[PDB]
Amino acid sequence: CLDLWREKNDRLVRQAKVAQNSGLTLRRQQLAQDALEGLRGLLHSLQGLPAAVPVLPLELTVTCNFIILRASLAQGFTEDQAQDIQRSLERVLETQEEQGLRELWDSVLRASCLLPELLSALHRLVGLQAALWLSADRLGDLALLLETLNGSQSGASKDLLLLLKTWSPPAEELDAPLTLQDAQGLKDVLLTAFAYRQGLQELITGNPDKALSSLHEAASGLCPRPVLVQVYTALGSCHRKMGNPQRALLYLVAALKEGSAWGPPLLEASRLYQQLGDTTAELESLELLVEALNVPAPQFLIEVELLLPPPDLASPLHCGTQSQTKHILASRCLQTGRAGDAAEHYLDLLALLLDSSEPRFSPPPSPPGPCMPEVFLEAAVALIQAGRAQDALTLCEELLSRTSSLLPKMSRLWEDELPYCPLWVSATHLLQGQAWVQLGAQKVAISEFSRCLELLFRATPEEKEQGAAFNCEQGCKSDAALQQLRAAALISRGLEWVASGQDTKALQDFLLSVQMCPGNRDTYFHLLQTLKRLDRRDEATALWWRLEAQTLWSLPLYLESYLSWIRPSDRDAFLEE
Amino acid sequence: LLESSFIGSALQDQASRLGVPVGILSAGMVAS
Amino acid sequence: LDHPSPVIPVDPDACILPDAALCAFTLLDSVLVTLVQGPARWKMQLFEQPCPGEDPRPGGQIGEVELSSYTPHFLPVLCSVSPSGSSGGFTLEDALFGLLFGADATLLQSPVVLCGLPDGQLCCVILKALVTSRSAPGDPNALVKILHHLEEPVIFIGALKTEPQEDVHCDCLVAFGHHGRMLAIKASWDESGKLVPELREYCLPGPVLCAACGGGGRVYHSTPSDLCVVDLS
Ligand SMILES: [Zn+2]
Numbered sequence: 001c002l003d004l005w006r007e008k009n010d011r012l013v014r015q016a017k018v019a020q021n022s023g024l025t026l027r028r029q030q031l032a033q034d035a036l037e038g039l040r041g042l043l044h045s046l047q048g049l050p051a052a053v054p055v056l057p058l059e060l061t062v063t064c065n066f067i068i069l070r071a072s073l074a075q076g077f078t079e080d081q082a083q084d085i086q087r088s089l090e091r092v093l094e095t096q097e098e099q100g101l102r103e104l105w106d107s108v109l110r111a112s113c114l115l116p117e118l119l120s121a122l123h124r125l126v127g128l129q130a131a132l133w134l135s136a137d138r139l140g141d142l143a144l145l146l147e148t149l150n151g152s153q154s155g156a157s158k159d160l161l162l163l164l165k166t167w168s169p170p171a172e173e174l175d176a177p178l179t180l181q182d183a184q185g186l187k188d189v190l191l192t193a194f195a196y197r198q199g200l201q202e203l204i205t206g207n208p209d210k211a212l213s214s215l216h217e218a219a220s221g222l223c224p225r226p227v228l229v230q231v232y233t234a235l236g237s238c239h240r241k242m243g244n245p246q247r248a249l250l251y252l253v254a255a256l257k258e259g260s261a262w263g264p265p266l267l268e269a270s271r272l273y274q275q276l277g278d279t280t281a282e283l284e285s286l287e288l289l290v291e292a293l294n295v296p297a298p299q300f301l302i303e304v305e306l307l308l309p310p311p312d313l314a315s316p317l318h319c320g321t322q323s324q325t326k327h328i329l330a331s332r333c334l335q336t337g338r339a340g341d342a343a344e345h346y347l348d349l350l351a352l353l354l355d356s357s358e359p360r361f362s363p364p365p366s367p368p369g370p371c372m373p374e375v376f377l378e379a380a381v382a383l384i385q386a387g388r389a390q391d392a393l394t395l396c397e398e399l400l401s402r403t404s405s406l407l408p409k410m411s412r413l414w415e416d417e418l419p420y421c422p423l424w425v426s427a428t429h430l431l432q433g434q435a436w437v438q439l440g441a442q443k444v445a446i447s448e449f450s451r452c453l454e455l456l457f458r459a460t461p462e463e464k465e466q467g468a469a470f471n472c473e474q475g476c477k478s479d480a481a482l483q484q485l486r487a488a489a490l491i492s493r494g495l496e497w498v499a500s501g502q503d504t505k506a507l508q509d510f511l512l513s514v515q516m517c518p519g520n521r522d523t524y525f526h527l528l529q530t531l532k533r534l535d536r537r538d539e540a541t542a543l544w545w546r547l548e549a550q551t552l553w554s555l556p557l558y559l560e561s562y563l564s565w566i567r568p569s570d571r572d573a574f575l576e577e
Numbered sequence: 578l579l580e581s582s583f584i585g586s587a588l589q590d591q592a593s594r595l596g597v598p599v600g601i602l603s604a605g606m607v608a609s
Numbered sequence: 610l611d612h613p614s615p616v617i618p619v620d621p622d623a624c625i626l627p628d629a630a631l632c633a634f635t636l637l638d639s640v641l642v643t644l645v646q647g648p649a650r651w652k653m654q655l656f657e658q659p660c661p662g663e664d665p666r667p668g669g670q671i672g673e674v675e676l677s678s679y680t681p682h683f684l685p686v687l688c689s690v691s692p693s694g695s696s697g698g699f700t701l702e703d704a705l706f707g708l709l710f711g712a713d714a715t716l717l718q719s720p721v722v723l724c725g726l727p728d729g730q731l732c733c734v735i736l737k738a739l740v741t742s743r744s745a746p747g748d749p750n751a752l753v754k755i756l757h758h759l760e761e762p763v764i765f766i767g768a769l770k771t772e773p774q775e776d777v778h779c780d781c782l783v784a785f786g787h788h789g790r791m792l793a794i795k796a797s798w799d800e801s802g803k804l805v806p807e808l809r810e811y812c813l814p815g816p817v818l819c820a821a822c823g824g825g826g827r828v829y830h831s832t833p834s835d836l837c838v839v840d841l842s
Binding site: 080358403 | 640746
Binding site: 244246247250251 | 580583586587
């Protein structure tokens with residue numbers, strides 16, 4: 001009967017490996033789950049018996065061949081495999097001599113120290129279980145397991161890497177029942193993978209000195225080409241944090257070369273060239289980036305990427321998507337003052353986002369970043385720094401056309417804190433307005449400066465009384481965003497009141513922004529320009545002393561740029577008179 | 578150079594560009 | 610459906626994404642939305658679906674996220690909701706569409722997917738926004754959001770054209786529980802000249818055991834006693 005069970009395990013292991021090497025995407029996973037259910041049934045048949053010593057090395061061979069092909073298909077380990085480990089371990093314990101895996105492992109390794117001749121399979125089981133606890137981030141007790149494996153005198157070695165290196169695989173793995181993978185093949189993987197994860201954590205925690213060692217360890221040995229890239233890329237960032245640009249460049253270049261997937265490098269390239277301020281190069285890298293991200297096999301084995309994590313947003317291996325990036329490009333461009341270019345980028349952005357009905361979806365920017373309306377604004381703001389004002393309006397038209405079916409229907413207009421206006425709707429109106437200024441139309445402009453200002457006063461934005469939806473968390477709630485946006489619409493108006501010659505009205509509106517937001521300072525400049533005209537001495541000096549008594553946090557992009565865009569050059573020059 | 582095996586491959590890159598044996602550039606660069 | 614005893618086995622050829630761990634799925638246009646069981650954390654997957662008459666393929670996954678909200682007989686259910694202009698689902702009226710999900714969704718003319726779950730939890734997800742990679746994972750809290758929590762498993766979602774005055778532009782979003790808290794939702798725009806959603810959570814008879822929507826604000830539902838009907842018109 002053990003003849004037939006071993007013949008069956010060997011048969012299904014040959015099926016699995018034939019499928020891994022050969023075949024098409026379906027027939028692969030069809031034969032793989034075929035073999036997984038064969039191994040399931042065979043494990044049930046062997047686990048039916050109150051295991052004998054000669055039944056044990058086949059049962060553990062089956063447990064290994066099952067767990068490997070289970071987690072390589074799922075493309076992740078879980079705790080079902082750990083319960084199956086507990087099952088097989090207490091099955092080894094009940095033969096010769098319960099509570100939990102850690103003490104069960106201690107007692108099973110004491111039983112293995114008696115040398116029953118299944119240590120080939122016990123070391124392979126430690127590799128699987130070690131991988132599990134590695135993918136589960138359980139690195140304290142993994143030290144305890146491998147510590148019990150080796151001498152208990154290696155107890156002070158809390159670092160895993162030394163401990164895994166000293167842990168030898170037991171044997172050349174003599175003519176036993178067939179296995180899909182050897183303990184040393186798993187040891188290699190464990191080493192590079194752990195090296196890798198320690199390195200990333202040390203990098204993100206501002207220790208890119210420590211990282212270099214572990215990661216070079218990740219370079220040296222088995223590390224598949226795809227990972228190799230990733231590691232080097234970390235190094236880009238490490239030397240980048242250091243100051244050492246060129247080492248960085250060199251690694252990055254390799255990463256490119258060795259790459260089939262060189263999104264992430266050029267992203268570090270960008271950050272680097274920013275650190276120099278080499279704006280020209282900066283933008284280029286990113287352009288290239290986008291086309292890169294334009295263009296786009298799983299073995300039934302335990303490879304590294306299985307044990308690798310999904311990276312964070314703080315990683316230098318965080319690379320978004322096409323659309324998300326294009327946004328960066330346009331964003332970055334807009335801050336520099338390449339407004340025209342910026343626009344075209346932003347329109348291409350928008351084209352992508354909205355027009356994508358036919359192909360694969362092309363997504364919007366993620367919400368540590370700006371929401372889909374903060375963006376359209378940035379679209380229209382560039383279009384204003386082009387002097388493309390009749391476009392900037394076909395945008396703010398299309399915007400308030402889609403979003404009618406939200407808005408505040410403004411009956412408080414007749415009844416005139418309580419109703420709600422998301423900051424962005426107040427602003428659309430502000431910029432509709434600046435747009436009309438470039439096309440030179442006092443009236444219909446000062447329509448829009450007053451119509452903003454009302455939706456900043458007979459509304460508060462800060463109105464979530466009901467969790468009714470999804471919202472701008474960040475951009476469109478800041479009291480900083482509000483007191484800066486007011487201060488603007490009032491500044492925007494005060495100018496138009498001087499273009500028509502009503503220095504009384506302009507005075508009112510400027511004096512109002514001051515009283516409101518005292519740390520824009522372009523507010524004080526316009527008022528003191530007004531005062532130097534009319535009523536210099538007393539007023540002016542009283543506000544000098546106030547400014548010098550007084551002496552950016554998260555302002556969203558469409559407004560920053562718009563403040564910079566209106567603001568004047570001899571501003572400090574005026575404040576020193 | 579002021580910042581190992583990479584720095585050797587970099588001098589190899591420069592040598593392949595200039596058509597100079599790597600020794601000449603390495604010596605010149607170390608001296609400078 | 611032509612498909613060249615009147616009994617027929619499928620061959621495993623016709624298999625596509627043997628993921629095995631997948632409960633529930635829907636269709637849009639050219640898109641496939643599955644919902645995959647795991648350990649505790651259920652994640653929603655999303656695949657292309659080939660628009661040309663080809664080999665009937667999945668493609669590569671665009672999108673996965675974790676229904677972090679969801680931690681385990683009752684098969685959860687999903688729904689498609691497309692707004693006006695942009696098929697096996699429900700279009701709303703742009704007022705509602707805008708009220709539930711918000712601006713992002715409305716702007717992008719994003720078809721949105723509602724998962725009810727065995728708890729009773731009724732979570733929606735914005736399919737423009739579910740595009741991710743290894744270097745670019747789903748955040749849960751971004752991307753899936755949670756509307757109302759019925760405290761019993763969910764049988765049925767739809768939308769309903771109340772005010773009746775093929776692509777019908779519904780005004781009212783309908784959920785059901787099992788023990789029979791049903792949940793209609795509407796547009797108000799009341800008393801603040803401001804949009805607020807009229808909630809009720811009515812509390813019907815029976816175990817409820819299947820539902821449907823038919824011409825003009827009438828739901829046709831089962832008790833285990835009798836086939837019963839409701840008006841919302
Ligand atoms: Zn926003």
